């Protein structure tokens, strides 16, 4: 009651019919009153000689007064009233509501354009926080309605709050909510959806100085007030799920859970702590009755592991990560596939595990559904070869890969082959050997031997495929004379006898196919001009050409594309092509020029009964059996002894090779030693 400081303002504030106050006198009076109350000290202040204005500033004539200045100074005064009288809480709840609806007005005007009193409204929000008089809002009968309104205001798109106040706002909403045990769902929608809607790094641009109020706010509420927001977050998930499950719209439920899941994933990237608040439901969802909710749940965790995060998932919630690697044994395949589809991105983005994976993929490469097996090998394609050698190590993975190459199922087998061959070449041009990694290398080295044992099954499509594959990746046509042979030996290094006999057999057919494409052009040139319409051999040469073109088509899967392609070439009867063709099969061609004859020949055939794209894919695989790639000017290189002594695993090949090249045809063999002589 008696203090060292005291209130010095004593001018009337209420305008009556008796004594009236013009607007501008009132504005300056309230300006003074406001300015004075700010400087007071809550403790060493009179407080008694102040009830005069305590009662005055609540007259509905000032609250809902027109001039914005008056309302704004009326507020700033009332802000200090509470502050000073607190904790006694001078006003009744009804007044307090009428007051707190006015403060919601001033906040509303704070994001708008300047009314000339933005400062007065900046004072208001900041002080209501500092002296925490704000939380008086939560002991009212309408607090829920108010709480909603308060939120809708700052989370309103149509308002432009400056970036200075974001800290303050977050504080305001932060305190006021800590006072609630059960927060209305409408609010929580507002807060959380702001993670879904505003994604940063979405548009690439100059500065991204854009920024957003509501976003930065929900960060503040979930980081700082994690402890109290985490209680509420759990209510959101359950309520939302509860709302959509019981929705008449039966198919809503899936759509919202797929949305809830996306909400979670943003949070792990920003405030991973909060995941705890719902990591439960996910665990129960993985074991849900409904395979779709299990599928979606799987997908989710799958994404999580790939995400940058200050925290680490498997550590924090190992409870569930073990349930996740438990889904490689689910009943529903649609679930098993969704698991495997995510692996390639995980491995690329983390090395955390290589144990639960190397335990799991060994079960995935041998599942009963062929869909997953395709998803597994697609790893060896999708993720780079380096990462593979690093992360996956388990023996059983590399064995089961090569094993599917002899599988009945087609779509697997094909992808399997093209995969395990494009792997082998990368696995030599990149990864080097050591005292330890040479452990699994024995398997990577026996790939080319595997591929050759496929000829023995005697299919056309496969024999066409292995043909197309080997010359693509294993034995390329590039880039030099020497490194072809260097790698060619390393290919033959780990061969069994079948691999050799078939390796030698394929090459023994190269000379018998050459004698057939050569005597094809010599028989296909018979329609160049009128030799024998029915003269010299007309009735017997047309039936030796026509019955010889089948001999080369009998080994092609679609022979009804093979005898089709080369009679439209007698229809073209274009000599340029005949020369490039004849030049590839004629044996003993410098390996370099063969490449040039061969490359122009395939590019020329693209875009002139049915499509010539077919003729390009038929000739290409047929040429692989006709022309000399391996038996050529490489002999000169295997001739030059790379090594004087040592490399008994290289010279027994040099023999093995040269030992055969002289036998299949010494038309080419015995001549290079007369030049060397």
């Amino acid at each position: 009651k008696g203090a060292v400081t005291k209130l010095k303002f004593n001018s009337p504030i209420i305008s009556t019919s008796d004594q009236l106050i013009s607007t501008n006198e009132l504005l300056d009076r309230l300006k003074a009153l406001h300015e004075e109350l700010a400087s007071l000290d809550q403790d060493n202040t009179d407080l008694t000689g102040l009830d005069k204005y305590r009662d005055a500033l609540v007259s509905r004539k000032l609250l809902k007064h027109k001039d914005v200045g008056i309302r704004a100074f009326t507020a700033c005064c009332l802000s200090d009233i509470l502050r000073l009288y607190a904790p006694d809480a001078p006003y009744t709840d009804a007044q307090l509501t009428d007051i707190f609806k006015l403060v919601l007005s001033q906040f509303e005007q704070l994001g708008d354009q300047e009314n000339g009193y933005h400062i007065q409204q900046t004072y208001l929000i900041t002080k209501l926080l500092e002296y925490r008089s704000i939380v008086l809002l939560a002991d009212l009968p309408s607090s829920n309605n108010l709480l909603i309104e308060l939120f809708h205001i700052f989370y309103d798109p149509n308002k432009s709050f400056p970036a200075r106040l974001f800290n303050v706002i977050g504080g305001i909403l932060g305190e006021v909510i800590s006072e609630f045990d059960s927060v209305p769902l409408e609010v929580l929608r507002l807060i959380f959806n702001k993670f879904l809607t505003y994604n940063p790094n979405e548009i690439p641009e100059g500065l991204n100085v854009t920024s957003d109020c509501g976003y930065e706010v929900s960060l503040i509420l979930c980081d700082t007030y994690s402890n109290r927001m985490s209680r509420h977050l759990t209510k959101y998930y359950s309520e939302i799920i509860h709302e959509a499950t019981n929705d008449d719209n039966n198919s809503r439920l899936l759509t919202v859970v797929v949305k809830l899941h996306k909400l979670v994933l943003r949070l792990w990237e920003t405030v991973p702590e909060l995941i705890n608040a719902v990591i439960g439901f996910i665990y129960h969802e993985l074991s849900s009755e409904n395979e779709l909710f299990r599928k979606e749940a799987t997908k989710l965790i799958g994404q999580i592991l790939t995400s940058y995060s200050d925290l680490n998932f498997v550590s924090t919630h190992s409870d569930t990560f073990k349930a996740w690697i438990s889904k490689i044994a689910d009943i529903s395949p649609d679930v098993r596939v969704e698991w495997t589809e995510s692996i390639p991105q995980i491995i690329a983005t983390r090395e955390d595990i290589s144990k639960e994976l190397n335990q799991a993929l060994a079960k995935t490469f041998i599942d009963s559904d062929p869909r997953v097996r395709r998803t597994s090998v697609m790893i060896f394609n999708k993720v780079p070869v380096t990462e593979i050698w690093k992360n996956i190590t388990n023996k059983a993975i590399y064995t089961s890969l090569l094993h599917l190459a002899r599988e009945k199922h087609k779509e697997v087998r094909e992808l399997c082959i093209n995969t395990m061959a494009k792997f082998y070449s990368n696995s030599l041009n990149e990864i080097e050997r050591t005292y330890q990694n040479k452990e699994i290398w024995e398997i990577i080295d026996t790939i080319p031997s595997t591929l050759y044992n496929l000829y023995y099954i005697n299919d056309l499509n496969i024999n066409e495929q292995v043909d197309s594959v080997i010359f693509e990746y294993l034995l390329p046509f590039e880039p030099d004379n020497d490194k072809r042979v260097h790698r060619l030996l390393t290919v033959l290094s780990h061969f069994d006898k079948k691999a050799f006999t078939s390796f030698f057999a394929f090459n023994a057919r190269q000379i018998k196919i050459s004698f057939a494409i050569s005597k094809y052009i010599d028989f296909s040139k018979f329609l160049n001009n009128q030799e024998s319409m029915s003269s010299s051999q007309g009735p017997i040469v047309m039936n030796k050409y026509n019955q010889t073109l089948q001999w080369l088509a009998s080994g092609l899967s679609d022979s009804t594309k093979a005898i089709d392609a080369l009679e439209t070439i007698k229809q073209f009867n274009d000599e340029r092509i005949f020369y490039l063709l004849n030049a590839c099969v004629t044996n003993d061609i410098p390996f370099l020029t063969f490449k040039n004859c061969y490359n122009e020949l395939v590019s020329k055939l693209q875009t002139p009964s049915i499509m010539p794209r077919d003729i390009a894919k038929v000739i290409q695989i047929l040429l692989f059996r006709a022309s000399p790639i391996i038996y050529n000017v490489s002999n000169i290189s295997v001739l030059l002894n790379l090594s004087n002594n040592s490399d008994a695993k290289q010279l027994d090949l040099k023999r093995r090779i040269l030992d055969d090249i002289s036998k299949v045809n010494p038309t080419l063999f015995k001549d290079q030693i007369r030049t060397l002589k």
């Binding site: 023995y456 099954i457 394929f506 001999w551």
Partner: peptide, 17 residues
């Protein structure tokens, strides 16, 4: 099931005529 090699080391990639 897995497929079986169905030729001999003698007649592999053979072509008559």
């Amino acid at each position: 099931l897995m497929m079986e090699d169905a030729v001999t080391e003698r007649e592999v990639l053979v072509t008559p005529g």
